[PDB]
Amino acid sequence: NSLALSLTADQMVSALLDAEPPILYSEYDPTRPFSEASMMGLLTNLADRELVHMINWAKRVPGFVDLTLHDQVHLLECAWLEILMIGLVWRSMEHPGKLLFAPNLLLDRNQGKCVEGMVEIFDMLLATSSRFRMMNLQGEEFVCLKSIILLNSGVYTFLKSLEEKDHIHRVLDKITDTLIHLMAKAGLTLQQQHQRLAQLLLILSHIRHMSNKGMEHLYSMKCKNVVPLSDLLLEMLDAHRL
Amino acid sequence: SLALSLTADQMVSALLDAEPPILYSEYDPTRPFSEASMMGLLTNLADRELVHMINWAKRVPGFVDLTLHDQVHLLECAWLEILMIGLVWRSMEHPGKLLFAPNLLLDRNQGKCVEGMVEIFDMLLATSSRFRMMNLQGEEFVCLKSIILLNSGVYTFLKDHIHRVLDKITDTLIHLMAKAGLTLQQQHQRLAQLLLILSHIRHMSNKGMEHLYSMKCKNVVPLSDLLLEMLDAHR
Amino acid sequence: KILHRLLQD
Amino acid sequence: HKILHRLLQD
Ligand SMILES: Cc1cc(O)ccc1C1=C(c2ccc(O)cc2C)[C@H]2[C@@H](S(=O)(=O)Oc3ccc(O)cc3)C[C@@H]1[S@@]2=O
Ligand SMILES: Cc1cc(O)ccc1C1=C(c2ccc(O)cc2C)[C@H]2[C@@H](S(=O)(=O)Oc3ccc(O)cc3)C[C@@H]1[S@@]2=O
């Protein structure tokens, strides 16, 4: 009906920055290495708490509140892990060779071995993080990307009165406008702007890929009855199966 | 090195010229299909399309510059995405339908024969409709397909050349849009819209791989040794 | 549906 | 040993 469509680029950034969730701590109590069951419990606990914050963060994403409850639910069920992943990668940027799950929980690929098959996803997360650092990704750019994920990943799976999927593309289009605005500000030529824009949107494909692979491993988790997943995670997880 | 010297038009012409041919499905009426038969037909078709993709790839400017093992990696990563975007492209003029081959035009009701193919079917259809509403041009499509090839496996390596090539293709896409008369804003908006669809194609591929593996383990229809090798790379 | 609930709020 | 190897060689 309105809202986000009347936002200047600068205003877009402001709202997105101001909406950022906090960096959570883990219950990570060092002393002794401890097992895959513990590491998974730590990560699960952390992820579950992050989801709660992500959910209230989405409400603050321009245009999201314009959506029907069912459509908000769909977008998040599709995008949650992608959003957690890009967040993890972003906060891990200046920690080459390590993932910063929490300020008190920094891990290298060797510690990822603790969990079967988690190493594969670990390496891809590191590779994404190295990419961002190579590109010198900016905070203002990161928040745009994260919102793009939220709006984009669930759209092509939405019919008579769709035509409000057009509202989502309208918003996505303004976020694109914002990205360009930012880049032109940093001294880039048009050619440079379009190239960087492409480079950033291409990374999203890889994040989609990481999420898919991650989901498969998560589902695996539950059925293995290894470490009990949170009710919220089980809910989200069942969305990518039925 | 050669690929970087090409003008935008030379890149477009090179990519168009390299397009693989449209193949036909093993003929024969016998309607309707069973799970086994349909899977038989699609498998045989996918296998022959693969062979052509592998030769199309070599004609992707700058792809030959890569070492063998790097070529293998990109193809093993991107093959199903590439078949998928091709299937979607030739299905555009057939709203509600997927044109697997000129003599194999299917609707979703037909895809329900096979276990969980309708899921992917509906996604492919949605991709087609998206392409139609955007009015995807053939020149844009070929750029998108090579981008997929160069990008999908790029971050599972250990790549500077490849990225320079990807940039070259970005310039080519913008170059195209400018000719169509699109204003600056329309140009980056369309660029993003196009590239974002790649994320969904990736999603379809991932979901697709899981189902192929399932069929393999189910052993309902023997997969070709080539498909098997391409599949095992994703596990 | 929790997400539903959390969102509703 | 890959079939893919052969098809790329040719
Ligand atoms: C991305 C992420 C963000 C977080 O805030 C916390 C964890 C994670 C990831 C994982 C994870 C672990 C437990 C859990 O309940 C939920 C998640 C999302 C693991 C993985 S995964 O869950 O996406 O894939 C798995 C899952 C299980 C497994 O044994 C191996 C990989 C990515 C990162 S860490 O490498
Ligand atoms: C994309 C594509 C191109 C072709 O030339 C032929 C088939 C396909 C697709 C599928 C397929 C089927 C059998 C096979 O041996 C190989 C492929 C690639 C199926 C799917 S899929 O392979 O990506 O996912 C599956 C696979 C098996 C299944 O039972 C359900 C979905 C997309 C289209 S059709 O819907």
Side-chain angles (χ1 to χ4, degrees), chain A residues 1-28 30-31 33-158 160-161 164 166-240, chain B residues 1-157 160-234, chain C, chain D:
Chain A
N1 298 237
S2 58
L3 281 178
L5 299 169
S6 305
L7 281 174
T8 69
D10 290 320
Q11 292 179 343
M12 176 65 73
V13 177
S14 296
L16 292 180
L17 291 190
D18 175 43
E20 275 299 89
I23 300 307
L24 304 181
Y25 282 80
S26 67
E27 318 159 276
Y28 172 57
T31 311
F34 297 154
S35 61
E36 170 181 337
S38 66
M39 188 175 303
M40 290 306 303
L42 297 171
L43 298 170
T44 297
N45 186 288
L46 182 64
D48 177 76
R49 281 181 286 118
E50 287 202 87
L51 285 179
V52 174
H53 283 270
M54 182 197 300
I55 292 178
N56 292 272
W57 157 83
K59 294 183 176 174
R60 300 189 64 181
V61 180
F64 198 78
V65 297
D66 288 324
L67 304 180
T68 67
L69 184 50
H70 286 279
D71 288 8
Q72 292 172 21
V73 170
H74 180 73
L75 291 182
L76 282 167
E77 287 185 348
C78 291
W80 67 274
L81 189 50
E82 284 192 82
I83 297 171
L84 287 175
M85 286 181 168
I86 196 172
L88 173 58
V89 171
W90 168 249
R91 63 177 177 260
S92 297
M93 263 198 57
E94 57 190 4
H95 297 283
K98 300 175 180 296
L99 296 178
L100 191 59
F101 292 88
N104 64 333
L105 187 56
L106 184 76
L107 306 181
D108 56 30
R109 64 176 300 178
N110 286 96
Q111 294 175 292
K113 303 292 187 57
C114 196
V115 182
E116 291 202 355
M118 191 173 66
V119 307
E120 181 168 7
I121 306 291
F122 219 82
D123 285 333
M124 290 189 282
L125 292 160
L126 286 171
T128 308
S129 176
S130 295
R131 180 61 183 168
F132 282 157
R133 186 170 50 258
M134 161 160 57
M135 293 188 68
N136 186 22
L137 184 66
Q138 297 301 284
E140 295 76 348
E141 292 176 319
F142 158 77
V143 298
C144 287
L145 287 177
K146 200 166 66 166
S147 286
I148 284 166
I149 291 181
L150 173 54
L151 300 171
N152 179 66
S153 295
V155 165
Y156 312 99
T157 53
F158 268 145
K160 77 193 176 58
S161 68
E164 76 171 348
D166 265 19
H167 176 69
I168 294 181
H169 285 106
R170 290 173 167 86
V171 177
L172 279 172
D173 282 343
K174 293 197 65 66
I175 300 183
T176 296
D177 299 338
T178 300
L179 279 172
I180 296 297
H181 177 82
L182 294 168
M183 302 175 53
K185 224 181 184 181
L188 279 67
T189 63
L190 286 177
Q191 180 173 30
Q192 303 178 334
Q193 302 171 25
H194 297 139
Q195 298 180 354
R196 178 174 188 80
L197 177 64
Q199 298 164 349
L200 296 180
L201 297 191
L202 286 185
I203 297 180
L204 296 197
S205 160
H206 178 56
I207 288 169
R208 180 71 72 113
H209 186 65
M210 290 193 291
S211 176
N212 295 143
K213 300 298 180 175
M215 295 282 191
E216 173 61 71
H217 286 303
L218 285 190
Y219 162 96
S220 177
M221 291 290 80
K222 84 160 301 181
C223 293
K224 290 191 295 293
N225 203 344
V226 182
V227 62
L229 292 160
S230 62
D231 293 338
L232 180 53
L233 272 165
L234 288 180
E235 255 200 13
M236 301 290 196
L237 180 51
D238 291 337
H240 283 243
Chain B
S1 60
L2 174 54
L4 294 178
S5 299
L6 295 181
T7 73
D9 292 334
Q10 289 173 345
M11 179 69 69
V12 175
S13 297
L15 296 179
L16 287 170
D17 198 73
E19 275 293 275
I22 304 240
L23 301 185
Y24 285 82
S25 175
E26 308 169 309
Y27 58 85
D28 184 38
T30 298
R31 298 299 186 267
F33 308 92
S34 62
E35 178 164 296
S37 68
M38 177 160 286
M39 294 313 303
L41 295 179
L42 298 173
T43 289
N44 180 285
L45 174 62
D47 174 81
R48 287 177 287 122
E49 275 197 297
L50 267 181
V51 177
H52 285 270
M53 175 195 307
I54 290 178
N55 290 274
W56 157 83
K58 292 147 68 173
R59 254 184 268 0
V60 175
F63 187 84
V64 170
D65 296 334
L66 298 163
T67 63
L68 178 54
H69 295 118
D70 282 13
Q71 289 177 0
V72 171
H73 180 72
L74 293 178
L75 272 177
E76 288 179 343
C77 181
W79 69 273
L80 187 53
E81 288 186 79
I82 291 163
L83 289 184
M84 278 177 167
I85 194 173
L87 172 62
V88 165
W89 167 245
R90 60 172 181 267
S91 294
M92 274 191 60
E93 271 49 15
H94 301 257
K97 312 273 184 57
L98 291 176
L99 183 71
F100 288 93
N103 60 338
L104 193 56
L105 190 64
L106 305 180
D107 59 49
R108 72 182 306 267
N109 293 292
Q110 295 175 283
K112 185 174 176 298
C113 297
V114 182
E115 211 64 352
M117 192 173 63
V118 53
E119 177 193 22
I120 304 295
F121 203 107
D122 290 333
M123 290 189 289
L124 294 164
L125 283 173
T127 311
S128 192
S129 298
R130 175 61 175 160
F131 279 174
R132 281 191 296 269
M133 182 184 60
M134 294 185 69
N135 194 22
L136 186 73
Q137 301 292 62
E139 285 75 21
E140 291 165 330
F141 159 76
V142 290
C143 288
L144 292 182
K145 191 165 67 170
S146 42
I147 289 176
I148 285 178
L149 177 61
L150 293 171
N151 178 72
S152 292
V154 90
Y155 293 117
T156 34
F157 271 141
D160 212 321
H161 168 74
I162 297 177
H163 283 113
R164 284 187 287 265
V165 176
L166 282 173
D167 289 341
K168 194 60 181 56
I169 300 184
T170 301
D171 300 335
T172 309
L173 279 165
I174 297 296
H175 178 258
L176 287 169
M177 300 175 179
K179 298 216 308 175
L182 299 192
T183 77
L184 291 159
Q185 188 189 35
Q186 298 180 340
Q187 300 182 34
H188 65 243
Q189 290 187 150
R190 184 169 179 86
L191 177 62
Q193 300 171 354
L194 291 183
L195 296 179
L196 285 182
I197 295 169
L198 292 198
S199 157
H200 175 66
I201 286 172
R202 178 84 78 139
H203 185 76
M204 289 187 310
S205 180
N206 290 328
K207 292 294 181 173
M209 288 294 188
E210 294 300 345
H211 288 302
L212 280 178
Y213 175 80
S214 172
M215 184 179 61
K216 169 192 175 185
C217 191
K218 178 66 180 182
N219 192 76
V220 282
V221 70
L223 302 176
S224 67
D225 278 7
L226 180 55
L227 271 168
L228 285 183
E229 289 182 350
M230 302 300 287
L231 177 62
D232 296 334
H234 283 252
Chain C
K1 198 54 50 184
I2 306 181
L3 174 55
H4 185 242
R5 196 178 84 224
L6 302 168
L7 275 166
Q8 268 189 339
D9 282 323
Chain D
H1 185 336
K2 293 266 185 62
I3 294 181
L4 187 51
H5 284 153
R6 198 215 310 136
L7 296 181
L8 285 175
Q9 304 293 44
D10 301 27

